[PDB]
Amino acid sequence: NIILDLLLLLLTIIYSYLEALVKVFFPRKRKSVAGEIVLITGAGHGIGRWTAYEFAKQKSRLVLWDINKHGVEETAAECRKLGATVHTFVVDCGNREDIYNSVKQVKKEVGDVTILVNNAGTVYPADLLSTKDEEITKTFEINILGHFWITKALLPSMIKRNHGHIVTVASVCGHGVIPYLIPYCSSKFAAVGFHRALTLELQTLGITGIKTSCLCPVFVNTGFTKNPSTRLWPILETDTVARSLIDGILTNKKMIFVPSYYNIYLILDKFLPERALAAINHLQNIQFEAVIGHKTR
Amino acid sequence: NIILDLLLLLLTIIYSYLEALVKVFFPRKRKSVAGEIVLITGAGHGIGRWTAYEFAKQKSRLVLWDINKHGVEETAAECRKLGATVHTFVVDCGNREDIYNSVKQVKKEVGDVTILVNNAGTVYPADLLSTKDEEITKTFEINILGHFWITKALLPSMIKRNHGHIVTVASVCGHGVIPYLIPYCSSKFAAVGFHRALTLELQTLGITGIKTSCLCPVFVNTGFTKNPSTRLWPILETDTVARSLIDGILTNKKMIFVPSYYNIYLILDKFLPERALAAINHLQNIQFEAVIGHKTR
Ligand SMILES: NC(=O)c1ccc[n+]([C@@H]2O[C@H](COP(=O)([O-])OP(=O)(O)OC[C@H]3O[C@@H](n4cnc5c(N)ncnc54)[C@H](O)[C@@H]3O)[C@@H](O)[C@H]2O)c1
Ligand SMILES: NC(=O)c1ccc[n+]([C@@H]2O[C@H](COP(=O)([O-])OP(=O)(O)OC[C@H]3O[C@@H](n4cnc5c(N)ncnc54)[C@H](O)[C@@H]3O)[C@@H](O)[C@H]2O)c1
């Protein structure tokens, strides 16, 4: 228990050092994204906002989508200070009709998107019996169904030119699960499944030019969940996540975990017995605001 | 290419007789389901139909749901020949309003469901750009969102009595992916995520009496997909799947793969490099009717 803690800390330290060593010994080649038309959904705040900043520094043409007009204009203002050409659109990324109508505007005013970042997301932390049905559907409408509509609208051009990049922002909740997040984990598993099946179908059809990347961070300090706490995982800073994402996109990395040492916990979750996984679970002590038993705890 | 077939044939034969050895050395205790109120969705045909037959032989009280009244009555007729008490209801298991209204009828006419089998499902095989948006939503409405509505309606009683069993019929498509099945794989990943997060939340809340099982089969000969063909996996007969499901429920098995040796391919998909996975993929030669490039291939 105390020694399990130290074991997990030493493995975390070994992974961190060894990965940093491989990044100097065998570095992956970075591609250029200058001049690419990058569409980022949920770009009005958090991961989407700081990912837009990274693409502005990379010299890409930006198309930012969000339901929050004020936020998306604040992001665009900063991207323009970084020297980027930005187009903002107020779009509900859970509404199919809104998505298709807005893609028509993007083609007319900007052109054909070459990099798509499906970042927009929502969460309503509560135990299954404290969830509202409307909140469950909204979670799927934004976290996964929106990915289908945007990808179907933007893929035709990418296939024609044999050139594109589809980034799916999922979560470690798309590989592992957390209590009081059943609809969220369910929708994030669907996002991982979509990325994996889209990657394979493109391979099967012989489409060599369209790359895919899946972003899977642990808790990030954006306010997405109120006051998160994990003993074994870090509460990430937004800029760190955006930096890891841009590094992964530029090197065509398919599955980007943040921090990369989450892979150790991923392997433990597949081979460890139930008793061992419950011991790690208690040590983790996950905390965050949620509605438990119809009361916000 | 050549030795690769017998390399996988060996890992299949070895698993088959090591599992049979563990079933004698460390046997799992089978529980009784006699007198339990078992609700099976999609019980009008295939896996749901033959699972109803297995529960009829187990002496449970059956509640069968399906959109096909003729088919669900044909299943009930056979369960009654097996000596079981069966109640049939025509329910759209993708329609939330229909689900809640029907749960009110089940409580009034039958009582409180203790075993829930979420089996109803749908598939529209096509490449992403040949899919219809209506087909994508229908896949999620039945394959995952219906699980949320039925489980939320039936869980309160199970928690009050600290006694229940939630069975999620997912697929190997909820762990691995197959091209031309992006919405299907995505919705099956969401079903696996729901089972895993439901299992953890019940554990976290101290609910010791509610068990969870997840049925993940390879292709089953039900007509669900047209003329399926797999070289390394068998095309399972429906009765085999129903037998494996009943054996897993009676021993409280959380993840039931059919055949159980799919676990070898599951581990190969996590540790083998891209080159080796594409070599096994070609050897697999998965075939089934699907709309490819707006043409039925
Ligand atoms: N924050 C975390 O702890 C965390 C961890 C893992 C994964 N993620 C994922 O990262 C993504 C971004 O989360 P974040 O932490 O940056 O959140 P955030 O709250 O900082 O920002 C999310 C943004 O998405 C926008 N958005 C919400 N619904 C939308 C809709 N219907 N249409 C358009 N835009 C919409 C919001 O307006 C907001 O600007 C999400 O997909 C989330 O699930 C977050
Ligand atoms: N057959 C396979 O190859 C296969 C493989 C893996 C997983 N599965 C899964 O097993 C489950 C059952 O498949 P099957 O092969 O037995 O199919 P099937 O087509 O033989 O039977 C499915 C049944 O579900 C019913 N159903 C469909 N939509 C419904 C709805 N809205 N409400 C109520 N009932 C509904 C149908 O009327 C039918 O009786 C599905 O979830 C499927 O995804 C099947």
XYZ file of C-alpha atoms and ligand atoms in Angstrom:
682
model
C 0.000 0.000 0.000
C 2.741 2.486 1.011
C 5.202 0.368 -1.052
C 2.635 0.138 -3.922
C 2.699 3.987 -3.924
C 6.539 4.065 -4.163
C 6.557 1.340 -6.845
C 4.100 3.354 -8.974
C 6.148 6.523 -8.428
C 9.416 4.777 -9.460
C 7.801 3.250 -12.576
C 6.411 6.734 -13.453
C 9.926 8.202 -12.995
C 11.547 5.442 -15.082
C 9.023 5.908 -17.982
C 9.435 9.735 -17.916
C 13.244 9.527 -18.062
C 13.362 6.746 -20.677
C 10.881 8.440 -23.025
C 12.786 11.754 -22.798
C 15.981 9.786 -23.669
C 14.336 8.137 -26.723
C 13.183 11.633 -27.894
C 16.893 12.616 -28.251
C 18.347 9.226 -29.410
C 15.645 8.345 -31.993
C 13.639 11.516 -32.781
C 10.593 11.275 -35.096
C 10.504 13.557 -38.197
C 8.275 16.636 -37.835
C 6.202 17.689 -40.810
C 5.165 21.255 -41.681
C 1.578 22.437 -41.208
C 2.227 26.000 -42.607
C -0.556 26.961 -44.997
C -2.867 24.112 -43.934
C -6.522 25.018 -43.246
C -7.038 23.840 -39.658
C -10.567 23.612 -38.219
C -10.653 23.389 -34.394
C -14.013 22.803 -32.653
C -14.456 24.023 -29.072
C -11.683 26.613 -29.765
C -13.249 29.210 -27.445
C -11.478 27.895 -24.321
C -9.168 25.222 -22.833
C -7.441 22.605 -24.971
C -9.034 23.916 -28.185
C -7.884 27.485 -27.460
C -4.254 26.573 -26.720
C -4.199 24.128 -29.688
C -5.262 27.093 -31.915
C -2.302 29.047 -30.470
C 0.078 26.172 -31.345
C -1.264 26.029 -34.934
C -0.963 29.883 -35.167
C 2.760 29.553 -34.258
C 2.971 26.742 -36.917
C 1.693 29.280 -39.559
C -1.557 27.462 -40.447
C -4.806 29.147 -41.624
C -7.307 28.798 -38.741
C -11.053 28.114 -38.769
C -12.357 28.205 -35.186
C -15.763 26.830 -34.126
C -17.586 27.222 -30.796
C -21.052 27.917 -29.281
C -19.382 30.688 -27.136
C -18.918 33.638 -29.596
C -17.065 35.738 -26.988
C -14.531 33.001 -26.251
C -13.872 32.018 -29.839
C -13.274 35.753 -30.715
C -10.850 36.055 -27.772
C -8.895 33.011 -29.092
C -8.903 34.437 -32.674
C -7.570 37.770 -31.365
C -4.544 36.001 -29.854
C -3.973 33.842 -32.942
C -3.953 37.057 -35.030
C -1.284 38.522 -32.645
C 0.770 35.343 -33.384
C 0.536 36.328 -37.113
C -2.221 33.898 -38.154
C -5.235 34.340 -40.463
C -8.289 33.274 -38.455
C -11.944 32.778 -39.374
C -14.440 32.340 -36.506
C -17.854 30.684 -36.769
C -20.487 30.192 -34.029
C -21.489 26.528 -34.473
C -23.256 23.995 -32.273
C -21.000 20.995 -32.841
C -23.705 18.632 -31.566
C -26.264 19.834 -34.181
C -26.015 18.084 -37.564
C -27.992 20.727 -39.496
C -25.832 23.536 -37.977
C -22.640 21.626 -38.822
C -23.527 21.082 -42.529
C -24.737 24.645 -43.018
C -21.496 25.978 -41.469
C -19.297 23.699 -43.624
C -20.959 25.370 -46.678
C -19.869 28.779 -45.245
C -16.339 27.557 -44.543
C -15.945 26.340 -48.173
C -17.317 29.626 -49.519
C -15.308 31.975 -47.268
C -12.129 29.981 -46.477
C -11.818 26.861 -48.660
C -11.194 23.162 -48.074
C -10.120 22.148 -44.529
C -7.009 19.928 -44.534
C -6.591 19.388 -40.746
C -9.639 18.707 -38.548
C -9.383 18.800 -34.735
C -12.588 17.399 -33.130
C -12.097 18.954 -29.703
C -15.597 20.231 -28.532
C -16.806 18.257 -25.498
C -19.259 18.227 -22.590
C -19.585 16.484 -19.225
C -22.312 16.269 -16.554
C -20.653 14.441 -13.617
C -23.272 12.423 -11.690
C -23.955 8.789 -10.716
C -26.204 6.939 -13.285
C -29.430 7.522 -11.304
C -28.622 11.282 -10.775
C -28.106 11.931 -14.533
C -30.712 13.749 -16.622
C -31.667 11.958 -19.872
C -31.197 15.228 -21.817
C -27.593 15.436 -20.431
C -26.898 11.828 -21.536
C -28.049 12.548 -25.122
C -26.170 15.878 -25.198
C -22.967 14.050 -24.142
C -23.257 11.683 -27.158
C -24.414 14.404 -29.555
C -21.269 16.500 -28.880
C -18.611 13.945 -27.816
C -19.141 11.452 -30.667
C -22.057 12.097 -33.093
C -20.621 15.553 -33.914
C -17.382 13.845 -34.968
C -19.325 11.802 -37.546
C -21.040 14.862 -39.085
C -17.894 17.044 -39.292
C -15.665 14.236 -40.541
C -18.234 13.209 -43.255
C -18.502 16.832 -44.401
C -14.716 17.428 -44.558
C -13.344 13.995 -45.617
C -14.474 14.127 -49.317
C -11.966 16.896 -50.150
C -9.166 15.165 -48.183
C -9.762 11.908 -50.086
C -9.779 13.772 -53.442
C -6.391 15.352 -52.692
C -5.078 12.267 -50.733
C -4.084 14.694 -47.976
C -5.500 15.350 -44.534
C -5.282 14.871 -40.775
C -8.238 13.922 -38.507
C -7.539 14.533 -34.794
C -10.001 13.074 -32.274
C -9.813 14.542 -28.781
C -10.966 11.650 -26.593
C -9.610 11.127 -22.947
C -8.016 8.401 -20.780
C -11.808 7.744 -20.099
C -11.866 6.206 -23.618
C -9.487 3.398 -22.444
C -10.155 3.271 -18.678
C -13.219 4.226 -16.623
C -14.019 6.567 -13.726
C -17.121 6.343 -11.448
C -19.809 9.077 -11.763
C -18.829 9.475 -15.474
C -20.740 6.539 -17.130
C -22.176 8.547 -20.107
C -18.853 10.412 -20.455
C -16.697 7.257 -20.444
C -19.171 5.576 -22.798
C -18.982 8.517 -25.295
C -15.152 8.709 -24.970
C -14.857 4.937 -25.726
C -17.000 5.634 -28.831
C -14.485 8.417 -29.826
C -11.525 5.995 -29.496
C -13.458 3.353 -31.476
C -14.242 5.924 -34.205
C -10.533 6.959 -34.483
C -9.397 3.315 -34.603
C -11.991 2.223 -37.187
C -11.453 5.391 -39.286
C -7.671 4.682 -39.250
C -8.226 1.068 -40.389
C -10.857 1.896 -43.057
C -8.532 4.548 -44.606
C -5.714 1.900 -44.636
C -8.102 -0.717 -46.190
C -9.219 1.708 -48.952
C -5.602 2.564 -49.839
C -5.913 6.198 -48.709
C -2.286 6.791 -47.697
C -2.431 10.587 -47.348
C -4.964 11.032 -44.551
C -3.411 10.775 -41.100
C -5.266 10.280 -37.816
C -4.323 11.190 -34.210
C -6.166 10.550 -30.935
C -5.568 12.858 -27.921
C -6.068 11.076 -24.529
C -5.199 13.343 -21.561
C -5.812 12.693 -17.850
C -7.466 15.603 -15.805
C -6.598 19.008 -17.338
C -6.927 22.277 -15.372
C -9.582 23.979 -17.601
C -12.648 23.904 -15.319
C -14.207 21.137 -17.538
C -14.561 19.207 -14.209
C -14.673 21.203 -10.954
C -11.680 20.733 -8.549
C -10.255 17.415 -9.872
C -7.764 15.446 -7.763
C -5.746 12.320 -8.711
C -2.897 11.098 -6.515
C -1.191 8.975 -9.176
C -1.901 11.305 -12.155
C -0.991 14.955 -12.609
C -3.612 17.701 -12.998
C -2.253 18.936 -16.346
C -1.864 22.521 -17.433
C -3.671 23.377 -20.688
C -0.528 24.596 -22.489
C 1.172 21.234 -21.758
C -1.700 19.328 -23.419
C -1.656 21.618 -26.480
C 2.136 21.188 -26.778
C 1.836 17.351 -26.610
C -0.955 17.430 -29.193
C 1.014 19.605 -31.673
C 4.097 17.389 -31.216
C 1.953 14.281 -31.900
C 0.275 15.756 -34.988
C 3.595 16.913 -36.511
C 5.124 13.436 -36.047
C 1.954 11.531 -37.203
C 1.545 9.847 -33.811
C -1.724 7.857 -33.747
C -2.408 7.630 -29.990
C -1.182 10.543 -27.859
C -1.517 9.933 -24.111
C -0.916 12.884 -21.797
C 1.206 12.155 -19.787
C 2.681 9.361 -21.951
C 3.307 7.268 -18.817
C -0.491 6.609 -18.639
C 0.512 3.585 -20.863
C 1.816 1.850 -17.717
C -1.635 2.103 -16.043
C -3.205 1.012 -19.373
C -1.156 -2.226 -19.314
C -1.816 -2.803 -15.589
C -5.614 -2.503 -16.275
C -5.382 -5.362 -18.831
C -3.284 -7.919 -16.911
C -3.708 -7.236 -13.171
C -6.286 -9.219 -11.119
C -9.357 -7.476 -9.605
C -7.767 -7.296 -6.114
C -4.658 -5.545 -7.519
C -6.669 -3.008 -9.541
C -8.856 -2.099 -6.534
C -5.641 -1.481 -4.467
C -4.353 0.942 -7.157
C -7.875 2.517 -7.364
C -7.899 3.293 -3.623
C -4.370 4.734 -3.833
C -5.491 6.945 -6.763
C -8.232 8.630 -4.652
C -10.024 10.289 -7.637
C -12.017 13.347 -6.588
C -14.075 15.923 -8.603
C -17.469 17.701 -8.278
C -20.392 15.414 -9.227
C -24.064 14.854 -8.340
C -24.171 11.786 -6.067
C -27.508 10.558 -4.703
C -29.201 13.696 -6.177
C -26.874 16.036 -4.161
C -23.786 17.850 -5.560
C -20.825 16.138 -3.750
C 2.764 -15.282 -44.712
C 3.072 -19.144 -44.753
C 4.181 -20.031 -41.159
C 1.960 -17.134 -39.833
C -1.194 -19.319 -40.337
C 0.114 -22.242 -38.220
C 1.631 -19.748 -35.688
C -1.953 -18.475 -34.945
C -3.453 -22.032 -35.272
C -1.018 -23.106 -32.447
C -1.984 -20.125 -30.205
C -5.680 -21.124 -30.854
C -5.219 -24.862 -30.097
C -3.066 -24.148 -26.997
C -5.701 -21.700 -25.579
C -8.525 -24.251 -26.269
C -6.927 -26.948 -24.077
C -5.330 -24.686 -21.399
C -8.775 -23.119 -20.719
C -10.364 -26.602 -20.524
C -7.618 -27.533 -17.981
C -8.328 -24.442 -15.813
C -12.087 -25.353 -15.891
C -11.204 -28.615 -14.021
C -8.332 -27.307 -11.781
C -10.033 -24.049 -10.634
C -13.772 -24.330 -11.413
C -16.112 -21.349 -11.032
C -19.317 -21.845 -9.022
C -22.572 -21.709 -11.000
C -25.446 -19.813 -9.434
C -29.164 -20.495 -9.881
C -31.340 -18.142 -11.927
C -34.632 -20.078 -11.245
C -37.397 -17.632 -10.406
C -35.446 -14.554 -11.570
C -37.321 -12.077 -13.803
C -35.189 -11.909 -16.937
C -35.810 -9.165 -19.517
C -34.222 -9.856 -22.926
C -34.351 -7.156 -25.633
C -34.272 -8.189 -29.274
C -35.631 -11.623 -28.225
C -37.515 -12.143 -31.514
C -34.556 -13.697 -33.316
C -30.858 -14.681 -33.148
C -28.796 -14.371 -29.973
C -31.735 -12.930 -28.004
C -34.030 -15.790 -29.046
C -31.599 -18.585 -28.121
C -30.627 -16.759 -24.871
C -34.373 -16.780 -23.961
C -34.362 -20.564 -24.587
C -31.364 -20.986 -22.239
C -33.093 -18.945 -19.490
C -36.311 -21.010 -20.048
C -34.272 -24.200 -19.365
C -32.808 -22.395 -16.268
C -36.433 -21.940 -14.943
C -36.466 -18.104 -14.963
C -39.566 -15.906 -15.550
C -39.139 -14.308 -18.994
C -40.003 -10.812 -20.230
C -39.238 -10.581 -23.957
C -38.999 -7.282 -25.874
C -38.835 -6.702 -29.653
C -40.220 -4.444 -32.435
C -41.241 -7.661 -34.338
C -44.413 -8.954 -32.580
C -44.542 -12.110 -34.741
C -40.927 -13.068 -33.976
C -41.078 -12.381 -30.229
C -44.308 -14.488 -29.980
C -42.578 -17.336 -31.846
C -39.715 -17.222 -29.260
C -42.206 -17.088 -26.329
C -44.068 -20.115 -27.759
C -40.856 -22.168 -27.605
C -39.945 -20.915 -24.111
C -43.435 -22.011 -22.953
C -42.771 -25.510 -24.445
C -39.567 -25.553 -22.289
C -41.889 -24.991 -19.244
C -41.275 -21.243 -18.772
C -43.652 -18.381 -17.936
C -43.177 -15.741 -20.645
C -44.500 -12.207 -21.088
C -44.011 -10.529 -24.490
C -44.036 -6.785 -25.137
C -43.645 -4.926 -28.456
C -41.066 -2.213 -27.621
C -38.758 -0.018 -29.684
C -35.575 -0.332 -27.642
C -34.109 2.775 -29.299
C -37.083 4.974 -28.192
C -36.765 6.408 -24.672
C -40.474 7.251 -24.277
C -41.476 3.730 -25.451
C -38.956 2.155 -23.044
C -40.221 4.033 -19.925
C -43.876 3.439 -20.750
C -43.192 -0.299 -21.232
C -41.245 -0.571 -17.954
C -44.440 0.698 -16.218
C -46.355 -2.196 -17.890
C -43.704 -4.749 -16.919
C -43.893 -3.682 -13.241
C -47.691 -3.817 -13.307
C -48.062 -7.166 -15.116
C -44.860 -9.059 -14.167
C -42.960 -7.301 -11.343
C -39.376 -6.135 -10.804
C -36.772 -7.348 -13.352
C -33.705 -8.875 -11.657
C -31.661 -9.867 -14.773
C -31.447 -7.464 -17.724
C -29.988 -8.615 -21.065
C -29.423 -5.619 -23.396
C -29.188 -7.611 -26.637
C -31.147 -5.626 -29.343
C -28.882 -4.197 -32.017
C -28.607 -2.894 -35.564
C -25.929 -2.526 -38.259
C -25.719 -0.730 -41.624
C -22.436 -1.923 -43.203
C -20.956 0.815 -45.439
C -17.756 2.898 -45.675
C -18.030 6.265 -43.772
C -18.896 8.297 -46.904
C -21.593 5.709 -48.002
C -23.410 5.824 -44.614
C -26.712 7.638 -44.166
C -26.870 10.019 -41.177
C -30.203 8.437 -40.108
C -28.442 5.014 -40.016
C -25.619 6.438 -37.850
C -28.092 7.863 -35.292
C -30.216 4.683 -35.316
C -27.075 2.610 -34.584
C -26.354 4.709 -31.440
C -30.013 4.940 -30.397
C -30.344 1.117 -30.270
C -26.771 -0.132 -29.612
C -25.946 2.196 -26.682
C -28.508 4.925 -25.786
C -31.203 2.247 -25.303
C -28.926 0.588 -22.727
C -28.912 3.834 -20.692
C -32.728 4.149 -20.675
C -33.449 0.489 -19.797
C -30.706 0.284 -17.178
C -31.848 3.573 -15.495
C -35.453 2.306 -15.413
C -34.554 -1.131 -13.977
C -31.546 -0.356 -11.716
C -33.482 1.411 -8.877
C -35.212 -1.847 -7.813
C -31.939 -3.835 -8.109
C -30.130 -1.318 -5.882
C -32.977 -1.374 -3.320
C -32.783 -5.189 -3.081
C -28.938 -5.295 -3.583
C -29.558 -7.944 -6.236
C -29.325 -7.872 -10.005
C -27.460 -8.700 -13.182
C -26.849 -6.337 -16.113
C -25.703 -8.100 -19.312
C -24.469 -5.894 -22.167
C -24.301 -7.576 -25.565
C -21.427 -5.747 -27.220
C -19.120 -7.516 -29.875
C -15.391 -8.060 -30.575
C -16.015 -4.701 -32.467
C -16.090 -3.074 -28.988
C -12.364 -4.014 -28.485
C -11.056 -4.265 -32.053
C -12.208 -2.619 -35.285
C -13.312 -3.781 -38.757
C -13.460 -1.507 -41.815
C -16.878 -0.520 -43.252
C -18.299 -0.681 -39.676
C -17.176 2.723 -38.212
C -20.567 3.661 -36.601
C -21.029 0.035 -35.459
C -17.551 -0.259 -33.905
C -17.962 3.190 -32.358
C -21.344 2.192 -30.740
C -19.942 -1.200 -29.589
C -16.934 0.566 -27.941
C -19.528 2.771 -26.159
C -21.297 -0.462 -24.955
C -17.997 -1.835 -23.543
C -17.274 1.552 -21.908
C -20.779 1.601 -20.368
C -20.339 -1.952 -18.944
C -16.879 -1.087 -17.543
C -17.954 2.231 -15.990
C -21.206 0.701 -14.642
C -19.124 -2.124 -13.057
C -16.762 0.397 -11.412
C -19.512 2.793 -10.206
C -21.406 -0.116 -8.562
C -18.111 -1.174 -6.865
C -17.427 2.467 -5.759
C -20.942 2.846 -4.263
C -20.609 -0.407 -2.298
C -23.344 -2.180 -4.287
C -22.115 -5.764 -3.916
C -25.233 -7.539 -5.202
C -25.485 -6.209 -8.779
C -23.361 -8.266 -11.202
C -22.340 -7.218 -14.743
C -21.401 -9.352 -17.810
C -20.425 -8.271 -21.334
C -20.974 -10.564 -24.314
C -18.359 -9.998 -27.022
C -18.777 -12.462 -29.905
C -17.066 -12.661 -33.342
C -19.467 -13.160 -36.411
C -22.587 -15.169 -35.535
C -24.653 -16.904 -38.246
C -27.953 -14.953 -37.670
C -28.162 -12.892 -40.876
C -27.280 -9.706 -38.853
C -24.543 -9.220 -41.531
C -24.885 -10.741 -45.020
C -22.638 -13.682 -45.905
C -19.836 -13.065 -43.350
C -16.486 -14.820 -43.888
C -13.441 -14.939 -41.489
C -10.375 -17.157 -41.972
C -8.904 -17.109 -38.365
C -12.267 -16.895 -36.508
C -15.188 -19.322 -36.811
C -18.634 -18.194 -37.953
C -20.413 -19.129 -34.731
C -23.750 -20.836 -34.567
C -26.397 -18.965 -32.533
C -26.894 -21.777 -30.009
C -23.148 -21.753 -29.233
C -23.256 -18.026 -28.394
C -26.342 -18.464 -26.183
C -24.665 -21.373 -24.358
C -21.476 -19.310 -23.727
C -23.584 -16.372 -22.497
C -25.569 -18.515 -20.032
C -22.327 -20.140 -18.740
C -20.799 -16.684 -18.209
C -23.874 -15.272 -16.414
C -24.125 -18.272 -14.082
C -20.441 -17.921 -13.101
C -20.577 -14.056 -12.840
C -18.011 -13.658 -15.636
C -17.543 -9.968 -16.481
C -16.192 -10.195 -20.052
C -17.359 -13.176 -22.134
C -15.542 -13.475 -25.472
C -16.894 -16.023 -27.949
C -14.704 -17.953 -28.675
C -12.662 -17.276 -25.497
C -9.435 -17.530 -27.522
C -10.246 -14.089 -29.086
C -8.191 -12.865 -26.030
C -5.015 -13.928 -27.895
C -5.875 -11.599 -30.836
C -6.798 -8.899 -28.268
C -3.275 -9.096 -26.749
C -1.594 -9.246 -30.194
C -3.464 -5.996 -31.162
C -1.853 -4.214 -28.142
C 1.788 -5.342 -28.432
C 2.458 -6.266 -32.075
C 3.906 -3.598 -34.430
C 1.890 -2.100 -37.351
C 3.569 -4.449 -39.902
C 2.649 -7.659 -37.986
C -0.951 -6.498 -37.416
C -1.438 -5.843 -41.174
C -0.029 -9.367 -41.926
C -2.584 -11.001 -39.570
C -5.329 -8.678 -41.018
C -4.644 -9.899 -44.579
C -4.632 -13.534 -43.392
C -8.032 -12.905 -41.656
C -9.655 -11.916 -45.024
C -12.856 -10.545 -43.397
C -15.731 -10.415 -45.863
C -19.433 -9.370 -45.520
C -21.951 -7.384 -47.646
C -21.306 -3.602 -47.303
C -21.956 -0.485 -49.409
C -18.501 0.536 -50.607
C -18.132 3.652 -52.735
C -21.946 4.001 -52.948
C -22.056 0.477 -54.552
C -23.082 -2.710 -52.686
C -19.854 -4.827 -52.559
N -10.442 19.091 -19.172
C -10.217 17.810 -18.896
O -10.006 17.399 -17.740
C -10.196 16.837 -20.044
C -9.608 15.584 -19.912
C -9.641 14.690 -20.968
C -10.254 15.056 -22.142
N -10.827 16.270 -22.248
C -11.531 16.622 -23.522
O -10.897 17.729 -24.104
C -11.865 18.497 -24.853
C -11.792 19.951 -24.455
O -12.079 20.086 -23.046
P -11.529 21.317 -22.191
O -10.971 20.830 -20.909
O -10.676 22.099 -23.109
O -12.900 22.091 -21.896
P -13.307 23.626 -21.690
O -14.530 23.725 -20.856
O -12.095 24.394 -21.323
O -13.693 24.080 -23.162
C -14.563 23.276 -23.974
C -15.000 24.177 -25.095
O -15.913 23.457 -25.950
C -16.976 24.325 -26.280
N -18.137 23.533 -26.654
C -18.972 22.851 -25.808
N -20.045 22.372 -26.387
C -19.908 22.765 -27.711
C -20.762 22.653 -28.825
N -21.943 22.027 -28.795
N -20.366 23.238 -29.983
C -19.197 23.885 -30.010
N -18.314 24.055 -29.022
C -18.732 23.476 -27.891
C -17.186 25.182 -25.045
O -17.858 26.390 -25.381
C -15.736 25.442 -24.626
O -15.198 26.646 -25.171
C -13.218 17.810 -24.620
O -13.539 16.929 -25.698
C -12.990 17.039 -23.320
O -13.932 15.983 -23.186
C -10.789 17.164 -21.245
N -24.901 -11.689 -35.450
C -23.644 -11.268 -35.361
O -22.801 -11.497 -36.240
C -23.240 -10.505 -34.129
C -21.892 -10.401 -33.803
C -21.501 -9.665 -32.697
C -22.458 -9.046 -31.923
N -23.759 -9.142 -32.264
C -24.752 -8.353 -31.467
O -25.705 -9.224 -30.932
C -26.982 -8.558 -30.849
C -28.048 -9.403 -31.503
O -27.684 -9.673 -32.875
P -28.301 -10.893 -33.700
O -27.232 -11.409 -34.586
O -28.979 -11.813 -32.761
O -29.396 -10.174 -34.620
P -30.781 -10.556 -35.330
O -31.014 -9.609 -36.447
O -30.848 -12.007 -35.590
O -31.806 -10.250 -34.160
C -31.824 -8.924 -33.599
C -33.176 -8.738 -32.967
O -33.249 -7.416 -32.395
C -34.516 -6.876 -32.699
N -34.437 -5.423 -32.622
C -33.814 -4.581 -33.503
N -34.009 -3.310 -33.260
C -34.818 -3.312 -32.134
C -35.438 -2.276 -31.412
N -35.374 -0.989 -31.764
N -36.222 -2.621 -30.367
C -36.382 -3.918 -30.083
N -35.856 -4.980 -30.697
C -35.086 -4.608 -31.725
C -34.847 -7.422 -34.074
O -36.227 -7.276 -34.391
C -34.369 -8.867 -33.923
O -35.370 -9.738 -33.407
C -26.768 -7.157 -31.433
O -26.524 -6.194 -30.409
C -25.532 -7.342 -32.309
O -24.838 -6.119 -32.514
C -24.166 -9.884 -33.309
